Amino acid sequence: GFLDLSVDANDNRLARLTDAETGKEYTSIKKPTGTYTAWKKEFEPKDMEKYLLSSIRDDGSASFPLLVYTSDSKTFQQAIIDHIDRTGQTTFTFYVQGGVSGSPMSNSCRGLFMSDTPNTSSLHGVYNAIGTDGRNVTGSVVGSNWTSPKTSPSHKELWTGAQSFLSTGTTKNLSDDISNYSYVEVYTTHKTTEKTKGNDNTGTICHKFYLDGSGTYVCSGTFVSGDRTDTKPPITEFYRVGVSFKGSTWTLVDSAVQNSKTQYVTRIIGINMP
Amino acid sequence: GFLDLSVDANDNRLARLTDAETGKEYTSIKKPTGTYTAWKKEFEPKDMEKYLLSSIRDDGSASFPLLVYTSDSKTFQQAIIDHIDRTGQTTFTFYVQGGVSGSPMSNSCRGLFMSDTPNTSSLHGVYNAIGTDGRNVTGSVVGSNWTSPKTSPSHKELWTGAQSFLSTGTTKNLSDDISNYSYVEVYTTHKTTEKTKGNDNTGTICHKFYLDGSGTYVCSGTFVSGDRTDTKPPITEFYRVGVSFKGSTWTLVDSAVQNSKTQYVTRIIGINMP
Amino acid sequence: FTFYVQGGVSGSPMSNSCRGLFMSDTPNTSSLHGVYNAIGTDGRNVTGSVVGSNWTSPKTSPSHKELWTGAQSFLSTGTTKNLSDDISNYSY
């Protein structure tokens, strides 16, 4: 390489060396009563890897710094500890293969681990992970004690309107296929037989079901209505609406009403509890 | 240090200075009709901090770029504004101490803030945060107006099968200890007394409870069944099942049924609403 | 990498405008494997995934707050009590 050397009357020194093969620069200094320092190389992308979310491959492609496989014979928690010990990275992305012990979820997942201090002997941090079905899981570590993973449920608004309980045999569309859901909420809006304090509106009431594959899901219940007096107790009534689901459609199958007022199905929400 | 100085016949200048203490290089230039520039230091990892999720400490360890403490006497919203004003970071990680005013949650938490433009006078952005219990919270800022924090609920499937209401005194396992949950969903699958439009299946119906510590949680209600005619209204019936929980187990305590057909408990889901 | 999506974009994580993080380990768009986490203008959370360039349906998370707790008797009719947040911040 080319060496540029400087030396003073007190034996302070500076050496800059540029490699004749690669064109990389290296620098070193010496004090009057000291040795030279080790050669400081010029800066390169790979010197940032401890602070990035991604590892830098030899082709300059970007990947996860942590990959955890069932062949490693390690838990997710020990893979995090080993990764923090090997790299000193505090915030980083990860992949975990399905079936890894202590994994955020049973399926394969990808996620982000976040912490402010790489102390594996008293680790403090959090993670957020997403599965091959789009499920969300979150969790934390506190003094190297690990909390149980918190799986989120999820939902979609499938249908909204006002379908009368008397409109039996009517079919309507859904915003998604019902087979994408394990649970459903059916919302019903009612007027009671008598008025209570001058109102007969009940609000809009949820019925939640597991999608067992039944030819009818049955919303049924009771109202108490009318104001209590010393001579008259409040009256009681019963109601039903039956509904069914098929692909991106739903049907009002049947109903029962014990008064002359119109009763409605008004919202349908698809639910997953993975 | 060592100064390498260059100066042309027109008074263009280049000064390269290397510090005799640290071995860091500094460069300055002057034009014929100008002054010297400020000293441009050599490149270092700290010069990237505006674009990273992590800060870089003096020992070269990673940490969060935002740490918020109750001693700071600031809201979380003001700590975000101060951080964006101090650093120009649009996407970054954070820690918030429990009891910080306007915090995503009451306990201590760790999270990610995301935005595309560091404009604190009309801030547009979002956050995701995780607590010391593993709870998840999300929120937004829109024209520097801040929305209320959205805490997500979480769940686990504790048991599934088909246990008859008549099987009173029977006990079964749960996939986790019930004391890990504040709420429970108990699912019941029923056949009605009469058929309606040729079906008596109700689907599988949710009963949701807060885990107040009761010795029985009482799933009870009604069905309407049969087909209406001008001479015969649909009939009515009542039902009950009582359940209890003890560590990693549950028991079918009692039941009532007003028809001869089998009624079942079929799912138990543990729920947290933190 | 991070992303912004405008409200009304086809196939968006949500109908409103949103901001989020996409995560993957290999840039193969002919067999793309990865996940996303997104947040809306109201603070809603949505997650989803891509697997062999097949796209999964977006999973919107619900949310809650404890507004009130105690033991108000059914006989205390006409009594008004406070909530920890405004009810207009909730749909259910």
CSV table of N, CA, C and O in Angstrom, one decimal, chain B residues 138-140 148-153 274, chain C residues 40-44 62-66:
chain,number,residue,atom,x,y,z
B,138,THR,N,-52.3,0.2,21.4
B,138,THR,CA,-52.1,1.0,20.2
B,138,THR,C,-52.8,2.3,20.2
B,138,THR,O,-53.8,2.5,20.9
B,139,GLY,N,-52.2,3.3,19.5
B,139,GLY,CA,-52.8,4.7,19.5
B,139,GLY,C,-52.2,5.5,18.3
B,139,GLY,O,-51.3,5.0,17.6
B,140,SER,N,-52.7,6.7,18.1
B,140,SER,CA,-52.4,7.6,17.0
B,140,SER,C,-52.3,9.1,17.4
B,140,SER,O,-52.9,9.5,18.4
B,148,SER,N,-57.4,8.4,22.1
B,148,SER,CA,-57.4,7.6,23.3
B,148,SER,C,-56.7,6.2,23.0
B,148,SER,O,-57.0,5.6,22.0
B,149,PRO,N,-55.9,5.7,24.0
B,149,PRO,CA,-55.2,4.4,23.8
B,149,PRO,C,-56.2,3.2,23.7
B,149,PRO,O,-57.0,3.1,24.5
B,150,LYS,N,-55.9,2.4,22.7
B,150,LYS,CA,-56.7,1.2,22.4
B,150,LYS,C,-56.0,0.0,23.0
B,150,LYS,O,-55.1,-0.6,22.3
B,151,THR,N,-56.4,-0.4,24.2
B,151,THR,CA,-55.9,-1.7,24.8
B,151,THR,C,-56.6,-2.9,24.1
B,151,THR,O,-57.8,-2.9,24.0
B,152,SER,N,-55.8,-3.8,23.6
B,152,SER,CA,-56.3,-5.1,23.1
B,152,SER,C,-56.6,-6.1,24.2
B,152,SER,O,-55.8,-6.3,25.1
B,153,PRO,N,-57.8,-6.9,24.1
B,153,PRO,CA,-58.0,-8.0,25.0
B,153,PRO,C,-57.1,-9.2,24.5
B,153,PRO,O,-56.6,-9.2,23.4
B,274,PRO,N,-57.3,-6.3,30.1
B,274,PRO,CA,-56.4,-5.6,31.1
B,274,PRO,C,-56.7,-4.0,31.2
B,274,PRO,O,-57.2,-3.5,30.2
C,40,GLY,N,-54.2,2.4,12.5
C,40,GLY,CA,-55.0,3.4,11.8
C,40,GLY,C,-55.0,4.8,12.4
C,40,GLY,O,-54.5,5.0,13.5
C,41,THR,N,-55.7,5.7,11.8
C,41,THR,CA,-55.9,7.1,12.3
C,41,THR,C,-56.6,7.2,13.6
C,41,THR,O,-56.4,8.1,14.4
C,42,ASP,N,-57.4,6.2,14.0
C,42,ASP,CA,-58.1,6.1,15.2
C,42,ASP,C,-57.4,5.2,16.3
C,42,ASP,O,-57.9,5.0,17.4
C,43,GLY,N,-56.2,4.7,15.9
C,43,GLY,CA,-55.4,3.8,16.8
C,43,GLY,C,-55.8,2.3,16.7
C,43,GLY,O,-55.2,1.6,17.5
C,44,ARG,N,-56.6,1.9,15.8
C,44,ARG,CA,-56.9,0.5,15.6
C,44,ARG,C,-55.7,-0.3,15.2
C,44,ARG,O,-54.8,0.2,14.5
C,62,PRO,N,-59.8,-6.2,18.2
C,62,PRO,CA,-60.7,-5.4,19.0
C,62,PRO,C,-60.0,-4.7,20.1
C,62,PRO,O,-58.8,-5.0,20.4
C,63,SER,N,-60.6,-3.7,20.8
C,63,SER,CA,-60.0,-3.0,21.9
C,63,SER,C,-61.1,-2.6,23.0
C,63,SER,O,-62.3,-2.6,22.7
C,64,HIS,N,-60.6,-2.4,24.2
C,64,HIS,CA,-61.5,-2.2,25.4
C,64,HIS,C,-60.9,-1.1,26.3
C,64,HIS,O,-59.7,-0.9,26.3
C,65,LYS,N,-61.8,-0.6,27.2
C,65,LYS,CA,-61.4,0.1,28.5
C,65,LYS,C,-62.4,-0.1,29.6
C,65,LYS,O,-63.6,-0.1,29.4
C,66,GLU,N,-61.9,-0.3,30.8
C,66,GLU,CA,-62.7,-0.4,32.0
C,66,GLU,C,-63.3,1.0,32.3
C,66,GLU,O,-62.5,1.9,32.8
